[PDB]
């Protein structure tokens, strides 16, 4: 049972990581990769309160607006498809909620993880990569084959980012199982 103070800290940390990373889909030499997708999966795993999700979605949107208006980041990725990010975040939340159902924290538990992880990321990847492909307007003549190319391009790096964070969150949990 966390005190209201400890919760505030957690919240800020989330928002912060978003603020810092949301501008890079994958790791630079000078930059950390967007932590948003692992964050929503992790809220599925851990957090019961439901308001927390639509609250962080708020923050995601705001952080993006600022970064593009004031922070001078491309508005390339912003389009009518933008809003498909939301079900992508819910799919990541639900997928964490799933993993939690049958956990065991065993080696087969890590094998169970690697599967869910693949599955939710894929789903978000369709919604974001595919939604942006077909519905942004940036692509003159989108087709299913060009969608597959895209998917093959982005799915893997963007699963790596996810992996790095979720694994690092598992590494940080055994530090709590041993305290
Ligand atoms: C690059 C990129 C960025 C860059 C900025 C864009 C830029 N152009 O500089 C960065 C890293 C800054 C970025 C930021 C964001 N992104 Co972004 N971004 C991408 C990415 C990786 C590519 C966009 C793209 O389509 N490329 C341009 C196209 C035309 O290239 P391509 O067809 O794939 O490749 C062609 C070229 O390589 C060309 N070619 C090859 N060699 C050469 C050489 C030369 C010289 C030339 C001219 C051409 C050329 O040929 C290829 C044709 O097949 C996509 C990934 C994706 N599609 O899933 C996301 C994506 C478009 N962005 C997305 C989003 C949402 C964002 C953010 C708004 C929020 C976020 N973090 O999720 C932020 C921006 C706000 C913020 N900072 O907080 C989402 C959009 C989702 C949606 N539903 O609309 C996508 C789909 C990623 C996702 N979440 O899966 N983005």
UniProtKB/TrEMBL annotation:
Membrane-spanning intervals of the chain: 4-23, 35-68, 80-99, 111-135, 155-179
So where does cob(II)alamin get bound? 22-23, 25, 34, 77, 81, 128-129, 150, 153-154
UniProt keyword terms in alphabetical order: Membrane, Transmembrane, Transmembrane helix
Q: Tell me the superkingdom of the source.
A: Bacteria
Question: What is the name of this protein?
Answer: Cobalamin ABC transporter
Organism this protein belongs to: Thiobacillus denitrificans (strain ATCC 25259 / T1)
């Amino acid at each position: 049972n966390l005190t209201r103070r400890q919760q505030i800290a957690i919240g800020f940390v989330l928002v912060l990581m978003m603020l810092l990373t949301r501008s890079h889909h994958w790791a630079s030499i000078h930059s950390l990769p967007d932590a948003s997708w692992a964050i929503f999966f992790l809220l599925g795993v851990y957090v019961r309160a439901l308001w927390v999700v639509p609250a962080l979605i708020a923050a995601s949107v705001v952080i993006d607006y600022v970064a593009i208006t004031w922070g001078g980041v491309s508005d390339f990725c912003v389009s009518p498809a933008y809003w498909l990010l939301i079900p992508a975040y819910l799919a990541l939340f639900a997928g964490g909620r799933f993993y939690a159902r049958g956990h065991s924290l065993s080696l087969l538990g890590l094998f169970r993880l690697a599967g869910v992880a693949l599955a939710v990321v894929a789903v978000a990847q369709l919604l974001t990569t595919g939604g942006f492909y077909f519905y942004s307007g940036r692509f003159a003549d989108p087709t299913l084959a060009g969608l597959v190319l895209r998917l093959e391009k982005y799915f893997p790096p963007m699963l790596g980012t996810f992996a790095l964070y979720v694994g690092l969150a598992a590494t940080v949990h055994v530090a709590l199982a041993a305290v």
